[PDB]
């Protein structure tokens, strides 16, 4: 058994041939322009023709996916995949068994299978980069929700909502690495495209007041979301991943900030398998489905 | 089989003899002073001696309860029940099988057993009165959490947390029937003890500006919590109960307010069995445990 795995990202499509124990024996990546579903389907077709010994296909996809039927009801950034049965498409194209699961869920499944969540029944995964991702593991099972939408952690309010559209008051729009860069551009007058997260943190470490405020507010927003999650789900562990891991000391920094809030026994630590989690979790889902 | 059921409330202890199909053939209630655990234990002993044909005991208790062992790790308002195994106490006192579950969880279980959640795998219960309660049903199972703490909906932030203790910025302290009365007392200068929720709503319906603001802010806080819950859990239904049901049109009023937020397919409606939900859910848990 050799499984063709696909992980549909924000800017790249990752692909691999994976053995049932998580050994990835071949990889391929492609930059994808403007999250164009047709380009993604084309890259898939090309990878499959190149790898004729695969016996199964496993997909990690953005948006909302019925994991049994393969119907993507909302394709995340990929409008082409709205109301698209990608499982049935791939089955028709190849004659191979296919499984599909949401991207955040797949990364959580990687954590459960091969990472730090192997023996945990109640943990969350929180991903912080350009946006916010979430996955929920409760009672030893993924929580997908009634319409496969669960885990939208970025939609939590970080402040009392005002009169602009509600999204503006949510973590997705207040508390991300992108928002930090946007704010720094506004405060300094410099072009966004020339600002890095690394420089903001470097300025922070050099006690720059503007940077201090930006980072302080960022951590407060993260703490707001963590407090909500802790009280709602009562996980034992929250694994934090994404672009934020570009800050080496971020877990220690969050714990410090959390002294004003209270972790309340919850363990916070980094997620594992940053590079391959989507592929590996897609495989885990596929392996569960084959049984 | 006749089950002695106990539901430990904020100001009353409800008691009943319940048949396995939810017919409650006898009831008794006692006002409890200052949530005194010893008084509760005394009332239990008296009810049991009065009802010698009971064959089992089912408890709905505040705080955090290990439902298999019966250990109450934190007794809610009842300090006497902190780190107290109420299951083992009752077993030793009576020789009868005993089950125990948290109060919010029991009320949700009543909804699942006999109410509006019978055929639902993903729903929440939100209780709004003097404080806020929560119960979570995901993947066809109660979510209790890693330490039996899950469902603390009142700890969600309704605004960006400030520098006072975090609780002050949570639904428990910003968005309750008690907070409404407190605010009305502050705004009018009248004593809290002389203010009713009913008068605030009556003044609201008569277009009193002060009342309008209080009610508007209350509904915004509820909408903040509902939006968070909807995105996190993706329930099909959220059942809302508690003191707030003293407002006959509150569901219609919340739906109206939610037009600025978006229910996103979620059905909101009132919880059922307001009077007996704790008793009935305690029984359901007991019946599950006996198998």
Curated annotation (Swiss-Prot), chains A, B:
Q: Which reaction does it catalyse?
A: D-cellobiose + ATP = 6-phospho-beta-D-glucosyl-(1->4)-D-glucose + ADP + H(+)
UniProt keyword list: ATP-binding, Carbohydrate metabolism, Kinase, Nucleotide-binding, Transferase
CDD domains documented for this protein: ASKHA_NBD_ROK_FnNanK-like (cd24068)
Would you say which domain of life the source belongs to? Bacteria
Which InterPro entries does its entry note?
ATPase_NBD, ROK
Family in the record: Belongs to the ROK (NagC/XylR) family.
Task: Describe the task this protein carries out.
Answer: Catalyzes the ATP-dependent phosphorylation of cellobiose to produce cellobiose-6'-P. May have a dual role of kinase and transcriptional regulator of the cellobiose-PTS operon.
Write down what this protein is called.
Beta-glucoside kinase
Specify the species.
Answer: Listeria monocytogenes serovar 1/2a (strain ATCC BAA-679 / EGD-e)
